[PDB]
Homo-oligomer: A and B are copies of this chain.
Amino acid sequence: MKLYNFWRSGTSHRLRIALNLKGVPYEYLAVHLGKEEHLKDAFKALNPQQLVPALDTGAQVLIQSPAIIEWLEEQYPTPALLPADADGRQRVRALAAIVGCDIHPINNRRILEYLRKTFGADEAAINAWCGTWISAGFDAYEALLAVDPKRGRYSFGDTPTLADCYLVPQVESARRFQVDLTPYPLIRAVDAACGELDAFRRAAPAAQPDSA
């Protein structure tokens, strides 16, 4: 297994947590987004979409972190990252999708570049943009954590799930874009509890080979 990814990438960080929780070994292959190595014909051979991450399983190159992570859950049952019952699965998947659909893609490099080059945005306007979508997404996420009475230390129950895999990288991203997280005690408690776990610690951007 070869993971084509980038240290500060939220989607890379997402897949790293899932892989580490499953204890699946993989070779770390850095694809430097700042250098735009993903925008080159060489990387297009691996991923036509030209985004990270991409996972070479040995037999094939897989794309889309959400699809890869669902794949890992089935290919590597232990520990389970999705609950067994329909209602629980739907809720974990919804919490994940708040991050995966409604926060992360909006703050992606290509988007911020568009805002800079087409809309003349300076860095303060970039940070105001990222904070808008994060705050909106975290508002909804936090509200959902509040109403779940059976919830323990993490997003759902008292074991780490897919939802935590999506949430942790997003909280890190929020801190990079200087998003004030005071209004989200519950998300911050989930993030800190996750931060105690080896799988999460090893996956963090600063622990990566290509870190600054």
Hey, which bits of chain A sit against chain B, CB under 8 A? 48-51, 60, 62-68, 70-71, 74-75, 86-87, 89-91, 93-94, 96-98, 100-102, 104-106, 110-111, 114-115, 118-121, 125, 128-129, 132, 136-137, 139-140, 143-144
Chain B CB within 10 Å — which of A62, A96, A105, A136 has the most?
A105
| A93–B64 touching, CB < 8 Å | yes
A143 to B119, CA, bound (A): 30
Copies of this chain present in the complex amount to 2
Question: Nearest B residue to A142 by beta-carbon distance?
Answer: B48
Question: Nearest B residue to A140 by beta-carbon distance?
Answer: B49
A137 to B63, CA, bound (A): 13
| B74–A60 touching, CB < 8 Å | no
Chain B residues with Cβ below 8 Å from A115 are 119
| B48–A68 touching, CB < 8 Å | no
| B51–A67 touching, CB < 8 Å | no
| B106–A111 touching, CB < 8 Å | yes
Chain B residues with Cβ below 8 Å from A96 are 67
A91 to B63, CA, bound (A): 8
| A140–B67 touching, CB < 8 Å | no
Q: Sample 11 A-B pairs with CB under 8 A, ordered by A number.
A: A49-B102, A49-B139, A65-B97, A67-B91, A67-B94, A67-B96, A68-B94, A71-B86, A71-B89, A74-B86, A110-B136
Chain B residues with Cβ below 8 Å from A101 are 64, 66, 100-101, 104-105
